[PDB]
Design a protein around this ligand. Sequence first.
Ligand SMILES: N[C@@H](Cc1ccc(-n2ncnn2)cc1)C(=O)O
Ligand SMILES: N[C@@H](Cc1ccc(-n2ncnn2)cc1)C(=O)O
Lengths: 305, 305
Amino acid sequence: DEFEMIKRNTSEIISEEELREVLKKDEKSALIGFEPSGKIHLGHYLQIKKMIDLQNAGFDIIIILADLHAYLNQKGELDEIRKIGDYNKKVFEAMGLKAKYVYGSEFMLDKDYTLNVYRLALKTTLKRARRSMELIAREDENPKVAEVIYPIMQVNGIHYVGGDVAVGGMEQRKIHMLARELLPKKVVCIHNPVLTGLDGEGKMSSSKGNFIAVDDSPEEIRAKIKKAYCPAGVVEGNPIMEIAKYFLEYPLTIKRPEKFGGDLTVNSYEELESLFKNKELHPMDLKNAVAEELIKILEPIRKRL
Amino acid sequence: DEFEMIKRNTSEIISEEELREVLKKDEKSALIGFEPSGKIHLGHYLQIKKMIDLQNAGFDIIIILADLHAYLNQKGELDEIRKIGDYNKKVFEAMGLKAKYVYGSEFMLDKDYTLNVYRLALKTTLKRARRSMELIAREDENPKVAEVIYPIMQVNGIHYVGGDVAVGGMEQRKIHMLARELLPKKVVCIHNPVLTGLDGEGKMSSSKGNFIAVDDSPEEIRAKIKKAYCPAGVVEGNPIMEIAKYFLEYPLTIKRPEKFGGDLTVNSYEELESLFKNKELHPMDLKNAVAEELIKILEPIRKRL
Ligand SMILES: N[C@@H](Cc1ccc(-n2ncnn2)cc1)C(=O)O
Ligand SMILES: N[C@@H](Cc1ccc(-n2ncnn2)cc1)C(=O)O
């Protein structure tokens, strides 16, 4: 089922009923935007996977390589950001997604767009805009005006592109709630879960260096998985369990010596969850399985580059 | 000075006198070998730097891309090793090293070469060979015959290539002592220091994932440096200090707020060592300086792609 395929592994859909209505349409577009990242990690991959899920559902996909937004979010100069964006496009392409790749600054500085940003700036309170940026803005002891221009420019972007659907992590939630509230056409929002960092603290961001990159070496992957936070019986905030939930193909065979129970096949992540919670499967065996299967999945991607 | 340039930042030279005698030669070669690595780190860079030092001293440089040795050291199949080796050549070339690059298997399987390995297998005791491999061999509960073939094959390689100088990390010391005992011609051995891991525990290897890759994103570098072991007034086993010693140019300016002492200029690593031990320079400020300067240095390398 197309609905359940798209719903699978999302934190929320705003709204489920509106999504149904968009599925009855032949031509339908979905959008996502990315601040260019120095290294594309699993969070990105999780989202690109959802875009492919949407594509296989008949959606035309649009990727905003958000150079301006990165500029506004203190990620350095536009010219170096556009390079990183190009590298990000190449990493996406390797993941097996065909879409329209658009740099933000291609349409985000035109007279009328700018005018509409200011139109929305009249409609958005400073407090509302600052709240929408809590999980997106760079840490700054002295928040810049640029921080509050960011959300309105994304909302306008959403308007300009004209996507039936907008996709992002749960960090994007508040900006999307804004978009729905302020624009004539309400966009259907699909929000993906925020992966936990490898050491287990906070969440997994590109600036925290707590991630598995899609082109990391098999030795890195094994070392990162090996080092990672993964307490016995604990599913919540466990990044290894998350990688098992969001990336791995089931049925999954976990190779273990007979000394420690022997190999065990699991038909579903729920089964794995169950076995892990009641101490039936040790973290180190979970880790080795996840690490090897992750390599097998990330292998074609690492090769292309 | 040429000798002092070559000596700069080495753990040892075997021997200093023998190096001098090689310096009076017009034609002189220096070799180093590498087990192909999925990611090229600072440990590699430190050595390629030393190879450039020798290059500028009038040394024809030979790089052995040791595919066979990696095969013997359980790094997987030969065909995939050769690819990683190719990628390794690309990184070395980016470091601005022009030299002869050679896959081990190009000459390490010829009748006479093999015969000479066996001639040496007859001269080398199992205990001696196992000892030479303590810091090189992959961890194994059940050590393989391949482990002890490795060191004799490197010695024979050293002999075959005919290099005046052999260069490597301190892990290669014992195998080099062997080569000097067993071969008609004694090779001058230049051993580079082994860099500490970012968590401060054990040396930095490409399989412990405790390293900074030369092509890491500026944010990874910043997060890696940020998380790294670097205790107040502690120089020994401090990777950040080591990075400062082996990679940074002097005079060095360390940017700090006037609140914490203001910017300070150091004209030598020694001065830095002093300031750090005196606790006159804080870890965080050391880190921030080291990270920004490390980016500037690793920038053009990362650019070649
Ligand atoms: N805020 C997103 C980036 C992002 C940038 C731009 C856009 N859109 N959507 C329509 N037009 N531009 C969406 C997300 C982040 O945290 O990476
Ligand atoms: N044992 C070195 C690799 C290495 C391999 C081969 C060679 N040579 N030298 C001459 N002929 N082959 C040197 C080092 C490591 O631990 O990476």
